[PDB]
């Protein structure tokens with residue numbers, strides 16, 4: 207419906223135990239948008255039902271002339287906090303639709319096709335908290351023996367990893383095994399692992 211408002215969204219990935227925030231752009235040939243609803247595909251024309259319940263949205267400056275032009279599109283905020291108890295797997299995604307109304311009452315048409323993803327149709331993908339972070343290379347810790355780290359040496363490795371990764375959640379737990387393997391356990395209890403050879407060396411070989 208070229209007469210209806212056009213929507214540009216994106217690939218909206220979110221993570222357990224983390225806040226998220228994305229913005230969609232909306233334009234109309236009349237230059238004006240009066241209403242914005244984000245919804246599940248089911249329900250009919252007047253339906254505004256949206257799940258999961260933690261998905262919120264907001265749109266400022268509605269019903270003003272020239273609020274949805276090509277030069278300055280109307281922006282809709284899509285945001286929330288992902289609970290720690292969400293189920294994550296290859297199917298833990300939710301396909302939703304952004305519908306906008308122009309002053310005439312023309313509304314964006316919902317088309318059920320993957321080729322429309324990133325437009326009025328978008329996918330909200332829920333992943334585990336570990337997926338948000340890529341643990342950065344730590345400075346190497348030199349230990350006495352790579353096959354047997356002391357308690358003090360294990361604490362040192364954990365400290366080095368933390369110092370190199372300030373963006374990792376403060377309450378995330380970093381543990382180190384007796385062979386130097388690092389495990390980062392995030393608040394949602396998912397994990398990242400760092401091999402011993404990227405964090406420790408010894409001087410046992412001449």
Ligand SMILES: CC(=O)N[C@@H]1[C@@H](O[C@@H]2O[C@H](CO)[C@H](O)[C@H](O[C@]3(C(=O)O)C[C@H](O)[C@@H](NC(C)=O)[C@H]([C@H](O)[C@H](O)CO)O3)[C@H]2O)[C@@H](O)[C@@H](CO)O[C@@H]1O
Nearest residue numbers: 246247248249257296297298299300301302317318319329
């Ligand atoms: C209830 C019913 O029969 N609805 C059909 C409707 O079917 C849905 O169509 C969507 C696209 O418009 C999606 O393809 C729905 O599938 C998914 C999704 O949202 O992407 C697949 C996911 O794997 C799944 N996620 C999980 C965690 O299970 C979700 C999820 O179950 C629901 O979104 C939760 O609300 O579903 C698909 O179910 C569609 O066929 C229309 C025709 O346009 O007809 C009915 O409304």
Ligand code: NA
Nearest residue numbers: 209235236308
């Ligand atoms: Na229009």
Ligand code: NA
Nearest residue numbers: 336337339398
């Ligand atoms: Na990770």
